[PDB]
Design a protein around this ligand. Structure first.
Ligand SMILES: N[C@@H](CCC(=O)N[C@@H](CS)C(=O)NCC(=O)O)C(=O)O
Ligand SMILES: N[C@@H](CCC(=O)N[C@@H](CS)C(=O)NCC(=O)O)C(=O)O
Lengths: 204, 204
């Protein structure tokens, strides 16, 4: 009955969802897409995510309902299981606020830092600085919030799960966390979770 | 009024003023002047630690603050029962297309604006990257809009999030030509009285 099909790859956005699945204890199976062979752009996959990116899930127990966008998947799974997002109005909204901060801010900006720092054909220092500086500013917003609360929305939630896999690779992006003591505490706490350790290994 | 709206005349601010106008919620406008750096003032950072607009304070809910346009939209829809279905699949479709906007259209078209209009040096590579990526996202929107009248089926907060960005495509240097479904959707939304009102907030 219960089964999530997960279409993913070893990237921060993929790890968001595998971490969530491991935390929640939901049965799932992994379809690891090869970017090398453009499998994320194949017609059969566009039927599931028209954007042709990972992650996406198909919920086999819900008439093979497709969900794309890591943040939407996290919300779907949290509502499905009642875990990792409070049911009350304020608690729920706080989670969604920090989740949106990740989806609109941390992920896209740090991703562009990766692009210009590591992947772009030509070296453009102006673009590199823009994104590394913007990522660092966002990290400072997180650090400030984590001075008032143990996790972003209070208790650990899908907002922390969305954000951690990006912060985790800050060195790859060329962004330092020096001086960010609250963020560092949070990094240490999350990386110690067994579900997080298991989720980071998917796909293998 | 029940809602205090902190905003400025940008696509992200227009998402929320459009939403409030569609829903018939009374609100008070606080137009922040970036010229005087009002969005970096400590009193505003208490509401949105990221120091950006839009943000709201819901007077009807113990002065609860909500930041991030996408989170504000979900909050308002849940408060009013408007512009997002109650059922599992219907709700999720809205959230998926909302996340597509928040993580994709907004950030990518915003970077196109930066390199095309605002960056201290002309970097044709960067301009091309974000204009091409924006066009690619528009084509995905166009495809979906062949399957349904609006992004999630019925008109919803997912359309309200996406329209203020598509509306300014020319500023970003990106064409909608050849995208007949997207063009149908642009025309249908621009014809809505509440959209016309929301786009005028705040006044000069
Ligand atoms: N906002 C989306 C972004 C997903 C995304 O950027 N996925 C990347 C890998 S981390 C991808 O599939 N890239 C392959 C491609 O664009 O061809 C989400 O969070 O799910
Ligand atoms: N993802 C955020 C983006 C907010 C955002 O970037 N707002 C801009 C105006 S559209 C802003 O406040 N910029 C002023 C600044 O960056 O200082 C949201 O949708 O609320």
């Amino acid at each position: 009955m219960v089964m999530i099909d997960l279409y993913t790859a070893a990237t921060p956005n993929g790890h968001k969802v595998s971490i969530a699945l491991e935390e929640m204890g939901l049965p799932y199976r992994v379809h690891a897409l090869s970017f090398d062979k453009k499998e994320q752009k194949a017609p059969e996959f566009l039927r599931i995510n028209p954007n042709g990116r990972i992650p996406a899930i198909v919920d086999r127990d819900n008439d093979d309902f497709a969900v794309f966008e890591s943040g939407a998947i996290l919300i779907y799974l949290a509502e499905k299981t009642g875990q990792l997002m409070p049911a009350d109005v304020k608690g729920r909204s706080r989670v969604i606020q920090w989740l949106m901060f990740q989806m609109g801010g941390v992920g896209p900006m740090q991703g562009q830092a990766n692009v210009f720092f590591r992947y772009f054909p030509e070296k453009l220092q102006g673009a590199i600085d823009r994104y590394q500086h913007e990522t660092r500013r966002l990290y400072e917003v997180l650090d400030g919030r984590l001075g008032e609360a143990e996790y972003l929305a209070g208790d650990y939630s899908i907002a922390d799960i969305a954000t951690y896999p990006w912060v985790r690779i800050h060195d790859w992006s060329g962004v330092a966390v020096d001086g960010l003591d609250n963020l560092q505490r949070w990094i240490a706490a999350i990386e110690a979770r067994p579900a997080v350790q298991r989720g980071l290994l998917v796909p293998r």
